[PDB]
Symmetry: D2
Subunit: 295 residues, 4 copies
């Protein structure tokens, strides 16, 4: 088929790259952790020597890395990664500040490459199932070329707008999630503190004007949804530290546009409190513990 | 059928009492505004001389009044309204502080009456259509007697818990609504300020982990949903002043249980800012104006 | 001299009433705790049978009680305490909601009594030293009669305004204190986290535009002021639970005037978090622990 | 004496550089605005062709510029300004993110230069009078050389710590100022809304545990201090836009250390609201208008 280079085999990168393999693409892979690489090699990937080595046969490069100033330093620094090229389609799927995505976008153009920012939403579970949503900034042209690849890794594919718009949509969405999650945790705790059964209150609000994604699919009160992180001591799911990061990127976007974000900013302050408390690697619904005394 | 006394023919009271009439009940009605009374009389109600006069033939008394310390002073003050009685089923459907609802509940019991607190959620539109949700505190017994009446005025009927639990569920739900509404308005403004089309961003978040009731049915950005208050300059809908009231009741419940409500409390501060600005009678999604400079 | 009745011998009441004794007044005292009464009796007070019994010889009644709806229920309920009277000067020095103080004020007038609300600021230490500040609402006349008594218990005496104005000044002042205290704790933690020595940062801010009462006299960072609660594990001082109460009264005043209090409301949310954590009886500067990971 | 190069003759730069002249130093000056340069030339400065030209005879370079990523791009970009040097003492007195100050500090060291970050606090008025406070990060050695220059432009000189510590102290201090200023404005509005005279409430709080810098010297309520910006419609003073900038830098420092700043972050959200409202160039105490309906 097409030769894909996949850089970044972490929590999200590994199952996303594995899904490309199951779809029948040939992948050269690179990650900093050897065992992450070996996992992909066992499933039919070839291992590359490095990021630069990987892209050196590829029709398309897909990155998925954990840090905002890891990603930019990788692509931009004047000694690869963009310096090594074709033109090849680039799909940059990390979550990074929109400003930083535009900066990479422009350098990619200045060089003749079709690039998309296509950050992703959904779980480690979405990544594994291939049901991720992509939020895509860039040229319609480049989105058309990338489509079959997004369809292999994901389900909803939104063209959010021009360069950087995928990151903008992503940071707005995740900031709103944080707000609705704290809103939900505080509402649950208030009701229960005032004599209500958690499951009765959850159902009422879910089905009414308080309704939201957390209440549909991710209730922060232990025992309400038995398959949610709250019912297994907030293990797994989506780390509070990652939510705090995402909120931090949203602040950067707000400074850039002078947008007021009183709920998001407060959400971020509360996430930082969770970090002081040692909860960086708990699922982000652990915010429940701020409000629930009997935990 | 059964003789109902209906006290309070305001925004919600009038269409609720009219719906009882359409269902075939006989109503004696009272309100402080003569034209509100005449509206009900034109539709087949009999006019009562007062609140006390009204209940003086009734199988059931349903109140629906605008103020928390109007309601309690009416029922409790030692010269009616509870002093005048049967036993008769009482449905108190105003939104009032849970503490205040328990106080009325206990006085009702101390006297032999079956009472429910059954505050309501849905619009002036829900009230008119008979699709309101009721959130009901009290004895299962009394809920069973009241059921056909709730079914005439509404659609979802939740037994939230014992005495006062309907108010608790109501204030938790509306506080959560306020949080998701400000969250949504601030997210929309952030995205648009960073180059996104409002309708594209709205669809992405609605369909993703930022998803919520406001995004499904009540988008705060003008032009996104043409039938929403935002698309007609925030006229009608659900007044900001009423949202500020509801948030205020939620604070009272929080003080009573020592519950921390950082998002709700902040929501209330922002609603109060809207009030200083003259927006008390705009739809509560007018909170959008705090964030959107081009309004 | 004059016969004083003193109701309430708690943390503040005991040393305040003791100071009146040292000034040479005759006191009849009552409190719910026998040992609090015995303390005053050892210092030269006579013990009264109750609140009603106490006022039954008095030129002036001074109360100082812990709860807002203890105080009002005591004076108003229609069976003493205001029902038993002269006219006698009443000094009500508890901290209670302004609305509640006006209610008591009016009942006192409706009966011929000169009453002041004169809530107090300063420590258990201020109370003991007789250096308290009084914040006084009521008639200039009544303030003139009370003056020598305030001078015995305190130092700064402010006439804040008419009936209830002492409570208004008190709740505004304490809400502002809470804001500056959290502001200070968060600033100290930010500086230290970014490599600064706590005492160097404290001195800079104290002497600059960040300067405030907490920095002058009550630094929340352990070791900065060796005589402050922070340097002895937040024992003693002014309980977080009492600060949360005061903030709660300030919210009630805000609802009454539709005033927006985003900083105070947030301060209250953070105090409530401290309560969930078990810190109700620590000094209110324990808020430092929210921000300082190494505590 | 010593030859000084002064880069940046804005609001603060002009009077600071003028004060050096009055102290008897020889200055070569550069700024982007010709009239700012001419002002200094009229007072005895020589005009330089540019930033690079200016430093090309100098014993010491002092910069004072408005933007955080103006300053760094000027000194670092690989074509001056640090590339042009001696070693010469560098005093970088802009307010910029601590991270950015360390970055410049390290490049300066990597090259043999003694550099201090010495951001400044005080007014356009402090700058003119020579009463500024300096908050200084860097080697004690370099502080000793710079001392007579700081003494010419300022009064309190604090050694905040090592490289970047001046910026850290500055951003903590100004964030705390913003919190106490909003705290003060909201407290004043609450008191006045509840029947108090603004000047009576101001005096009580200033002299009590609510006491702070704003209340001593910069009251946000019009008419309270006749010489404050509030008494002349918030013209002049210290622009809200600059306060919003400073708060933004404080957020960057918080992200860098994972510090929770709930009051500062909220302060920033409220400042951004002021910006949407058109108040960017009003004195930052204009935040009063959020709370005071009769303005």
């Amino acid at each position: 088929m097409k030769q894909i280079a996949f850089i970044g085999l972490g929590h999200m990168g590994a199952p996303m790259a594995t899904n490309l393999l199951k779809a029948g693409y040939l992948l050269n892979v690179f990650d900093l952790v050897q065992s992450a690489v070996d996992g992909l090699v066992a499933a039919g990937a070839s291992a590359a020597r490095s990021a630069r080595d990987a892209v050196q046969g590829a029709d398309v490069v897909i990155s998925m890395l954990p840090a905002s100033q890891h990603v930019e330093g990788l692509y931009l620094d004047d000694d690869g990664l963009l310096a090594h090229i074709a033109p090849t389609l680039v799909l940059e799927c990390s979550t990074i500040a929109p400003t930083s995505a535009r900066k990479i976008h422009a350098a990619a153009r200045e060089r003749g490459l079709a690039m998309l920012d296509a950050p992703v939403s959904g779980g480690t579970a979405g990544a594994a199932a291939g049901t991720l949503t992509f939020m895509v900034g860039g040229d319609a042209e480049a989105l058309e070329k990338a489509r079959p690849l997004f369809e292999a890794m994901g389900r909803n594919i939104f063209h959010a707008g021009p360069d950087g718009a995928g990151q903008v949509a992503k940071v707005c969405n995740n900031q709103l999630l944080a707000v609705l999650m704290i809103g939900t945790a505080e509402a649950m705790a208030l009701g229960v503190a005032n004599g209500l059964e958690a499951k009765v209150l959850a159902e009422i609000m879910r089905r009414s004007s308080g309704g939201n994604w957390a209440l549909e699919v991710y209730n922060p009160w232990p025992g309400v949804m038995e398959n949610a992180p709250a019912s297994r001591d907030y293990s797994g799911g989506f780390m509070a530290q990652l939510m705090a990061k995402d909120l931090g990127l949203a602040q950067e976007a707000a400074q850039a546009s002078a947008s007021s974000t009183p709920m998001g900013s407060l959400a971020l302050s509360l996430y930082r409190l969770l970090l002081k408390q040692g909860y960086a690697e708990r699922d982000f619904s652990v915010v429940q513990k701020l409000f629930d005394p009997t935990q």
